């Protein structure tokens, strides 16, 4: 057994292996999510496809239950083992207390798994950040995120990945109340958001909405070809 | 200094520096003075505080009905040996149905604290235990140190600025083996006014006294019942 303290304090009060892992998040591909009052909409950008690969094994939006979706950034090898440990816990909740898992509960499991893992012996911390999105019982759509140090934290709109400060500055000057008016109008905020990021001009973006009673339903590159037309068409006439 | 890092490493002079640095930790805590008569064992402590509204940190603890201790150093390792101290007293009382003798208790501590002074990546216990108790042989004053070396003594004083208290105890220890409980205590109280700056001494909220006695169970006196003992001292000569 390898017993060695990896994460230790700095002489001024930092945890260096934590904040080095935050920079591995800061060059993964961008993931943006907002919530509507009835339909949540989150979609990663930079699919970065090379037209010789299977398109389904590269997906970064998975589901933990029927109601809880999840996107991430950072490095993918650490991601899909946190996900598989979350799938067991949200299934073991049902063998216990009968209701399906509330979206706040599954964030506390991931965040507490991630903290104690910056505390044990001989373990580097995880290098991912996540967005947990769900519409729980009694239909209240909400989302969260998870820092690699393990601080779960709710939001109304957020973005992580490479180029996340510029998108977060873009949303606060754009997030009104009437932006979440229609289920097709909230999507026009996300498609306007990631187009203000690393190119992805309809060819590298994959939105995925959830209408509070469905599962995740990814629109194929025909409505995004339709939406990016009309989002740029309104931009064409006003300016 | 590459010989200054781990407890395992000997110096080329032959003095392990990690043990010598734990002696610096016991010199940081406030002073306390223990002494004994023919029939009594009295230890007197001097508390400290952080602000004027925060309370004073206690130092005298109750191990058993005939054993009490006084700590100096970091308080977390003090409670670690204290919960070991209480456990070794009541199981001997569970097995043999007798009070565990004091001189046989301290040798369990000396074997307890010597173990992390020899392994790898194990700190010593920075603590300043003065022990007062009863065998069937009368009172006993014992002190320890983080070098796992316990001392049999008749009056000692440890903590910050304690050398001035030892000089007072040497020139008055011919009188200690005769007096009753009253001026045995205020012999020790004249040692704590020795180890202070020349303006504040004994304002009834920073001093504590614990006595075990030949027909007297170990009793701690705190900040109101100190005042009968504390009256009857002369002014500081200047």
């Amino acid at each position: 057994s390898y017993d060695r303290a990896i994460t230790v304090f700095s002489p001024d009060g930092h945890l260096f292996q934590v904040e080095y892992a935050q920079e591995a998040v800061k060059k993964g591909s961008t993931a943006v999510g907002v919530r509507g009052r009835d339909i949540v909409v989150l979609g990663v950008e930079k699919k970065s496809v090379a037209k010789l690969q299977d398109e389904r094994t590269v997906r970064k939006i998975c589901a933990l239950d029927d109601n809880v979706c999840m996107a991430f950034a950072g490095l993918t090898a650490d991601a899909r083992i946190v996900i598989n440990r979350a799938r067991v816990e949200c299934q073991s909740h049902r063998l216990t207390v009968e209701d399906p898992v509330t979206v706040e509960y599954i964030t506390r499991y991931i965040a507490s798994l991630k903290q104690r893992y910056t505390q044990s012996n001989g373990r580097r911390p995880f290098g991912i950040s996540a967005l947990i999105v769900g519409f729980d019982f009694d239909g209240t759509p909400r989302l969260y995120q998870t820092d690699p140090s393990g601080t779960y934290h709710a939001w109304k709109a957020n973005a992580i990945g490479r180029g996340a400060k510029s998108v977060r500055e873009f949303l606060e000057k754009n997030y009104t109340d009437e932006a979440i008016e229609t289920d097709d109008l909230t999507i026009k905020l996300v498609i306007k958001a990631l187009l203000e990021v690393v190119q992805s001009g309809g060819k590298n973006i994959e939105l995925a909405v959830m209408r509070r009673d469905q599962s995740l339903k990814i629109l194929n590159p025909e409505e995004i070809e339709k939406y990016v037309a009309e989002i740029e068409k309104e931009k064409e006439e006003n300016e | 200094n590459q010989y200054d890092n781990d407890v395992t490493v000997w110096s080329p002079q032959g003095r392990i520096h990690q043990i010598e640095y734990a002696m610096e930790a016991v010199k940081q805590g406030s002073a306390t003075v223990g002494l004994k008569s023919k029939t009594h064992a009295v230890l007197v402590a001097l508390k400290r505080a952080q602000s004027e509204l925060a309370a004073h940190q206690k130092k005298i603890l109750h191990v058993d009905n005939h054993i009490g201790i006084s700590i100096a150093g970091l308080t977390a390792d003090a409670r670690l040996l204290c919960n070991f101290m209480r456990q070794e007293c009541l199981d001997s009382r569970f097995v043999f149905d007798r009070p565990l003798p004091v001189s046989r208790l301290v040798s369990l501590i000396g074997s307890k604290t010597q173990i992390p002074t020899q392994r790898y990546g194990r700190r010593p216990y920075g603590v300043g235990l003065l022990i007062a108790g009863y065998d069937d042989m009368g009172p006993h004053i014992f002190q320890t140190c983080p070098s796992a070396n316990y001392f049999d003594c008749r009056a000692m004083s440890i903590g910050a600025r304690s050398q001035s208290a030892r000089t007072y105890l040497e020139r008055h220890m011919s009188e200690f083996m005769e007096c009753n409980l009253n001026e045995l205590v205020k012999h020790g109280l004249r040692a704590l006014r020795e180890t202070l700056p020349a303006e504040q001494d004994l304002t009834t909220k920073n001093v504590s006294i614990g006595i075990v006695g030949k027909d007297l169970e170990f009793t701690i006196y705190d900040d109101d019942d100190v005042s009968p003992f504390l009256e009857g001292l002369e002014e500081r000569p200047q």
Binding site: D3, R4, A5, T7, V8, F9, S10, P11, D12, G13, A111, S112, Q115, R116, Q119, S120, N121, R142, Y144, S149, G150, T151, H153, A154, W155, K156, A157, N158, R168, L171, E172, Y175 | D4, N5, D6, Q18, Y21, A22, M23, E24, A25, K27, Q28, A49, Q50, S51, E52, L53, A54, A55, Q57, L74, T75, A76, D77, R79, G121, R123, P124, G126
Partner: protein, 228 residues
């Protein structure tokens, strides 16, 4: 170059216990005041973004029905100590059929605070206030990353800790009331925080001898603010 985690200084203290004392100077500030009418206890939130939901974060959390808490420094490892305190108050109720006193909660946590090493891995970087009403009345305690706890009367912990303590020694006296202790704390928090004071940047909680642990919410809270 690299020491172990368990090494004394030549001045004798430690290395990483003393480094963790520095880490709670980055946390948000928090004020607790003990009054014989009851314990009031406040904090700021340090809201970063307008898009952020404000109520998802918390600093006041309850341990039992008669004991509240307040955390500073890091947050993610504070939740480990909170869960050990909640279990400890329920094991004491299960085996003794009574309420654990406020002091005996604190030493049950403070024994846990210095247990790292290389067998069986770093000290916790939080600082806690424990406000409660046991049978000796209202109490107020303060622990350390070093595991050293002591009863305080008006303790201010956070990034603005030493600036607030000086302004708090002048207004505190032993015969306060709870209605003026609540007002006296928000005068101090109005100085030390960055943004303006409103009903969302701060939150309070008071514990009484009569009723149990009560946390204020954004309806009864701003009557203190508009009548500051």
């Amino acid at each position: 170059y690299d020491r172990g985690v368990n090494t004394f200084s030549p001045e004798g203290r430690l290395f990483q216990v003393e480094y963790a004392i520095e880490a709670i100077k980055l946390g948000s500030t928090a004020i607790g005041i003990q009054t014989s009418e009851g314990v009031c206890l406040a904090v700021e939130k340090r809201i970063t973004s307008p898009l952020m939901e404000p109520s998802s974060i918390e600093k006041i959390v309850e341990i039992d029905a008669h004991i509240g808490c307040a955390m500073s420094g890091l947050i993610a490892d504070a939740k480990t100590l909170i869960d050990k305190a909640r279990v400890e108050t329920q094991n004491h109720w299960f085996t003794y059929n009574e309420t654990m006193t406020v002091e005996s909660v604190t030493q049950a946590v403070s024994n846990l605070a210095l247990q790292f090493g290389e067998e069986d891995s770093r000290p916790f970087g939080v600082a806690l206030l424990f406000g409660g009403v046991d049978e000796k009345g209202p109490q107020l305690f303060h622990m350390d990353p070093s595991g050293t706890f002591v009863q305080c009367d008006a303790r201010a912990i956070g990034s603005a800790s030493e600036g607030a303590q000086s302004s708090l020694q002048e207004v505190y006296h032993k015969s306060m009331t709870l209605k003026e202790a609540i007002k006296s704390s928000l005068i101090i928090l109005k100085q030390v925080m960055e943004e303006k004071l409103n009903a969302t940047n701060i939150e309070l909680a008071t514990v009484q001898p009569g009723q149990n642990f009560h946390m204020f919410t954004k309806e009864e809270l701003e009557e203190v603010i508009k009548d500051i």
